[PDB]
Amino acid sequence: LEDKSPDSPEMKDFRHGFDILVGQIDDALKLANEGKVKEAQAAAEQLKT
Amino acid sequence: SLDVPLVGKYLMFTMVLVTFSIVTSVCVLNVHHRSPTTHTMAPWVKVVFLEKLPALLFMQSVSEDWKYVAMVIDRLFLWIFVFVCVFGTIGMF
């Protein structure tokens, strides 16, 4: 998607998805601050989805 | 086969010019259907195909900008088949 402008909702729905992927690491690092391994592995299978 | 009739020479030469037209029509149809995600558009193409056309007496988005190249290549070919088609009747005289 090149000549469609970066403020278009073609580009924005791409940019709507990319705050979730930090937050699923922030779902993963939320349980990781205890260091519980299987709850750090609870969101480790989530990030492929 | 000691002599060839005159209608057969003229029909065989216009068959040769029609198969040259189908090869240049396939090249014009491939140049028309390009797109910026698949193709490159070098500067040489811009400064030789958006600058030539006042030698044609032809006067004035990348997906329009490929489509104006494909207007101007076959309209160059319209002059150089009409100059052969008038020559092919003064090959009779």
UniProtKB/Swiss-Prot annotation, chain A:
List the biased-composition ranges (Basic and acidic residues): 1-13
Q: Where, subcellularly, is it found?
A: Periplasm
Q: How does it assemble?
A: Monomer.
Family of the protein in this entry: Belongs to the cytochrome b562 family.
Functional summary from the UniProt entry: Electron-transport protein of unknown function.
* Protein name, as recorded: Soluble cytochrome b562
The species this protein belongs to is Escherichia coli
UniProtKB/Swiss-Prot annotation, chain B:
Q: Which domain of life is it from?
A: Eukaryota
Report the transmembrane regions from the record. Answer: 7-31, 74-93
Task: Report the locations given in the UniProt record.
Answer: Synaptic cell membrane; Cell membrane
* Subunit details: Neuronal AChR is a heteropentamer composed of two different types of subunits: alpha and beta. CHRNB2/Beta-2 subunit can be combined to CHRNA2/alpha-2, CHRNA3/alpha-3 or CHRNA4/alpha-4, CHRNA5/alpha-5, CHRNA6/alpha-6 and CHRNB3/beta-3 to give rise to functional receptors. CHRNA2:CHRNB2 and CHRNA4:CHRNB2 nAChR complexes exist in two subtypes: LS (low agonist sensitivity) with a (CHRNA2/4)3:(CHRNB2)2 and HS (high agonist sensitivity) with a (CHRNA2/4)2:(CHRNB2)3 stoichiometry; the subtypes differ in their subunit binding interfaces which are involved in ligand binding.
The entry's linked illness reads: Epilepsy, nocturnal frontal lobe, 3: An autosomal dominant focal epilepsy characterized by nocturnal seizures with hyperkinetic automatisms and poorly organized stereotyped movements.
Name the job this protein performs.
Answer: Component of neuronal acetylcholine receptors (nAChRs) that function as pentameric, ligand-gated cation channels with high calcium permeability among other activities. nAChRs are excitatory neurotrasnmitter receptors formed by a collection of nAChR subunits known to mediate synaptic transmission in the nervous system and the neuromuscular junction. Each nAchR subunit confers differential attributes to channel properties, including activation, deactivation and desensitization kinetics, pH sensitivity, cation permeability, and binding to allosteric modulators.
Concerning its family, UniProt says: Belongs to the ligand-gated ion channel (TC 1.A.9) family. Acetylcholine receptor (TC 1.A.9.1) subfamily. Beta-2/CHRNB2 sub-subfamily.
Instruction: Write the protein's name.
Output: Neuronal acetylcholine receptor subunit beta-2
Instruction: Identify the species of origin.
Output: Homo sapiens
Residue numbers of the full-length protein present here: 291 to 478 of 502
